[PDB]
Amino acid sequence: KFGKGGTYP
Amino acid sequence: ALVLTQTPSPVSAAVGGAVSISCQSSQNIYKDNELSWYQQKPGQPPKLLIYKASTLASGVPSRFSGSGSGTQFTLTISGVQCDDAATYYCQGSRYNNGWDSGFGGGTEVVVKGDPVAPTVLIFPPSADLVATGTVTIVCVANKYFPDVTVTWEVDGTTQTTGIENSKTPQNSADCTYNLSSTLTLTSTQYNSHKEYTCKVTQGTTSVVQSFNRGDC
Amino acid sequence: QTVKESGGRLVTPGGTLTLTCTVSGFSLSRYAMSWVRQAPGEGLEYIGWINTYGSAYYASWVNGRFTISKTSTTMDLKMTSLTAADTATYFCVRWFADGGMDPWGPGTLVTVSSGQPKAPSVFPLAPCCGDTPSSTVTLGCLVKGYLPEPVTVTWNSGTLTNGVRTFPSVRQSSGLYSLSSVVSVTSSSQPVTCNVAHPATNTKVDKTVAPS
Ligand SMILES: [Ca+2]
Ligand SMILES: [Cl-]
């Protein structure tokens, strides 16, 4: 998950 | 290479019934569940329905549910409405020294509402259209379900070329279609015949409209 | 949160085009983004993505023909050596860590063709003049000979919407596009006007249609 940013709220 | 394969189009369901769409991955999806589902209506962007195989996005009706893990995923619509008529896409990722992602090919859902026979209109070319050297004759089949076939006849001869059909999406309130069918000829060809006929067939019923060039 | 694509147009085969995805309501430092395209009548096709650090990755078929880059508020897609296989609606999406693509933009259309932009011609659709009238009549406009898509159609300057059916465009054997729009009115209604707009040529056409 490097670079993959944030998860669905 | 990750390949996602969906149930072939079309899939049908009666209003109030249930439909299931499969998405099979050629490889295990990341965490076994990084699979999402999208709804797309014609001319609109896709809409996220479900992510992580079974979690609904904000505002999505609970008649949508997702299940599966690993390689075999299912989207289910319970209490199908006309407003659910759409193409459905899965999207998945696996980690192979980087993110490898793909979409399934899409499954069109046809929602069966109350059957209704088309009304049919035919439009002769305007004088200024004929003056261009290329004639377009327009036939429309309004507010119908299920699908129709369209035949063009010109003084009794079935046309086999110059025909284009264009169908609206299913109506979100009553599941019905509309259809435009066009016959394109040269003005020379158009002026060499009398009777132009649009025949719209829905199973064992046909509705036929004609005009006589010269009477219009 | 919104994303909006721009830059779609007619482009010559072999040509180069750059599309832009403009975002608002979220940081490109905090979320990944993707480009997805759809050829007319075909499925969604993943093109590539860009991570929060600006590293772009591509579908195996791209083969260095496309470049994805970003700024603080935009992401680009530069496409080279374009062919008819690249004619499509191009969408940008925010791509959540746990895989959901949301939101999507409206899409921008890339039309890879040798032709020149061409404005639509509009022709009235009215029933054969000899037909007995009934209480209601269906009138219409045929819009043809335009490139690229799309056109928009309204009736009476967007004030007539009930009983309007506007069909999907078709590409004619000429290579130009065509569509019709029809509307049902009371037989003694005032004439109705179709309003056709073609953004690519900044062309607007009105056509007033009356019972034959
Ligand atoms: Ca594909
Ligand atoms: Cl894909």
Asked if the peptide bond before residue B42 counts as cis, ω within 30 degrees of 0, the response is no
Ligand index nearest the alpha carbon of residue C39: 1
Q: What domains lie within chain B, and their CATH numbers?
A: 4-112 (2.60.40.10), 127-212 (2.60.40.10)
Residues of chain A contacting B56 with CB distance shorter than 8 Å:
none
* Cα separation, C28 vs B212, whole angstroms: 63
Residue B143, CB-side half-sphere exposure with 13 Å CA sphere: 9
B89 residue type, one letter: Y
* Cα separation, B72 vs B29, whole angstroms: 9
Q: Are both C30 and C103 inside the same structural domain?
A: yes
Residue C26, CB-side half-sphere exposure with 13 Å CA sphere: 22
Q: Are both C83 and C31 inside the same structural domain?
A: yes
Which of B49, A8, B54, B37 minimizes the C-alpha distance to C1?
A: A8
Instruction: List, as ranges, residues with CB under 5 A of the ion ligand 2.
Output: B 102-103; C 45-46
Q: In the structure encoding, which two tokens stand for residue B76, read together?
A: 């289910």
Provide the strand spans (E) within C80-202: 88-95, 101-104, 108-112, 121-125, 136-146, 152-155, 164-166, 170-171, 177-186, 192-198
Which H helix or E strand runs over B189? helix B187-190
Residue B122, CB-side half-sphere exposure with 13 Å CA sphere: 25
Nearest-by-Cβ selection for A5 from C52, C55, C102: C52
* Cα separation, C56 vs B98, whole angstroms: 11
Nearest-by-Cβ selection for B48 from C45, C60, C102: C102
Q: Are both C11 and C106 inside the same structural domain?
A: yes
Q: Are both C103 and C6 inside the same structural domain?
A: yes
Q: In the structure encoding, which two tokens stand for residue B198, read together?
A: 């649009």
What Cα–Cα distance (Å) separates residue B115 from each residue in B17, B19, B119? 16, 19, 13
Domain end marker among C86, C112, C138: C112
Q: Are C120 and C108 in contact (CB under 8 A)?
A: no
Q: What is the resolution of this structure in A?
A: 1.8
Q: Are B24 and B71 in contact (CB under 8 A)?
A: yes
Q: How was this one solved?
A: X-ray
Which H helix or E strand runs over B190? helix B187-190
Q: In the structure encoding, which two tokens stand for residue C157, read together?
A: 């300057």
The CA angle C127-C128-C133, to the nearest 5 degrees, is 70
Q: Are both C45 and C65 inside the same structural domain?
A: yes
Residue B157 burial (CB count, 10 A): 10
Nearest-by-Cβ selection for A8 from C51, C53, C98: C98
The values of phi and psi at residue B30, to 5°, are -55, 135
Q: Are both C106 and C132 inside the same structural domain?
A: no
Domain end marker among C79, C112, C145: C112
Which of C169, C54, C110 minimizes the C-alpha distance to B182?
A: C169
Ligand index nearest the alpha carbon of residue B105: 1
Q: How many domains does chain C have?
A: 2
* Cα separation, C118 vs B37, whole angstroms: 38
Q: Are both C125 and C34 inside the same structural domain?
A: no
Q: Strand C108-112 to strand C10-11: parallel, antiparallel, or no bridges (unpaired)?
A: parallel
Which of B67, B105, B70, B71 minimizes the C-alpha distance to B88?
A: B105
Nearest residue in chain A measured CA to CA from C56: A3
Q: Please name the residues in contact with B188: beta carbons below 8 A apart, sequence gap of 6 or more.
A: B133
Domain end marker among C67, C88, C112: C112
Q: Are C128 and B124 in contact (CB under 8 A)?
A: yes
Q: Please name the residues in contact with B102: beta carbons below 8 A apart, sequence gap of 6 or more.
A: B2, B3, B4, B91, B92, C46
Q: Are B197 and B209 in contact (CB under 8 A)?
A: yes
Q: Are both C92 and C132 inside the same structural domain?
A: no
Per-window interface: B 4-23 vs C, CB < 8 A: none
- Tell me the shortest Cα–Cα distance from C88 to chain B, in angstroms: 12
B114 residue type, one letter: D
Q: Are both C108 and C182 inside the same structural domain?
A: no
* Cα separation, B15 vs B26, whole angstroms: 33
Residue C176 burial (CB count, 10 A): 16
Q: Which domain holds residue C10?
A: 2-112
Q: In the structure encoding, which two tokens stand for residue B204, read together?
A: 């064992």
Q: Are C19 and C110 in contact (CB under 8 A)?
A: yes
| CATH at residue C92 | 2.60.40.10
* Cα separation, C212 vs C195, whole angstroms: 20
* Cα separation, C38 vs C20, whole angstroms: 17
Tally of residues, chain C: 212
Nearest residue in chain A measured CA to CA from B56: A8
C86 residue type, one letter: D
Q: Are B30 and C95 in contact (CB under 8 A)?
A: no
- List, in sequence order, every residue forming a beta bridge with B139; answer none if it has no partner: B122, B181
Contact C99 B99 (CB under 8 A): no
Q: Are both C7 and C104 inside the same structural domain?
A: yes
Residues of chain A contacting C34 with CB distance shorter than 8 Å:
none
Contact A6 C51 (CB under 8 A): no
Asked if the peptide bond before residue C168 counts as cis, ω within 30 degrees of 0, the response is no
* Cα separation, C154 vs C90, whole angstroms: 26
What Cα–Cα distance (Å) separates residue B103 from each residue in B33, B47, B93, C188? 15, 14, 9, 52
Q: How far is the CA of C42 from the centre of ligand 1 (A)?
A: 8
Q: Are B169 and B124 in contact (CB under 8 A)?
A: no
C194 residue type, one letter: C
Q: How far is the CA of B6 from the centre of ligand 2 (A)?
A: 12
Which residue's entry shows tokens 């079935």?
B158
Q: Are both C50 and C152 inside the same structural domain?
A: no
Q: In the structure encoding, which two tokens stand for residue B65, read together?
A: 């549910």
Which of B50, B14, B17 minimizes the C-alpha distance to B34?
A: B50
Nearest residue in chain B measured CA to CA from C51: B99
Q: How far is the CA of B37 from the centre of ligand 2 (A)?
A: 14
Q: How far is the CA of C45 from the centre of ligand 2 (A)?
A: 4
Burial class (CB in 10 A: 0-12, 13-18, 19+), C96: buried
* Cα separation, C82 vs C113, whole angstroms: 9
Helix (H, G, I), strand (E, B) or coil at B144: strand
Q: Are both C73 and C7 inside the same structural domain?
A: yes
Contact C127 B121 (CB under 8 A): yes
